Design a binder for this molecule. Structure first.
Ligand SMILES: *[C@@H]1O[C@H](CO)[C@@H](O)[C@H](O)[C@H]1NC(C)=O
Lengths: 49, 50
């Protein structure tokens, strides 16, 4: 009843109580990752994925 | 938190096919699949060899 937010194993906040209702929301971080370019040799084609 | 984990190139299912292949070569053909094509030999005679 008194708890306002929750944490993952290593410090990071992973859930919050909405202060107006009582709902508990999980937080997922922004989607992110490496852009990687898959290519034949430029000697044979210029199409890439 | 800016950290990313990348998958292995070979899945656990693909590794389990290679460990089945090495095992099925070893059972049916002794060491011969390490020298060339697998040559079948009866398993009692492969142990008689070993
Ligand atoms: C806050 O107000 C809303 C209506 O706007 C109400 O539905 C909600 O139960 C209230 N929560 C409390 C008691 O803080």
């Amino acid at each position: 009843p008194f708890q306002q937010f929750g944490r993952d194993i290593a410090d990071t906040t992973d859930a919050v109580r909405d202060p107006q209702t009582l709902e508990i929301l999980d937080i997922t971080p922004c989607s992110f990752g490496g852009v990687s370019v898959i290519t034949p040799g430029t000697n044979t084609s210029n199409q890439v994925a | 938190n800016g950290l990313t984990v990348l998958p292995p190139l070979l899945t656990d299912e693909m590794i389990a096919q290679y460990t089945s292949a090495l095992l099925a070569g070893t059972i049916t053909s002794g060491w011969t699949f390490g020298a060339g094509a697998a040559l079948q030999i009866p398993f009692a005679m492969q142990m008689a060899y070993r």
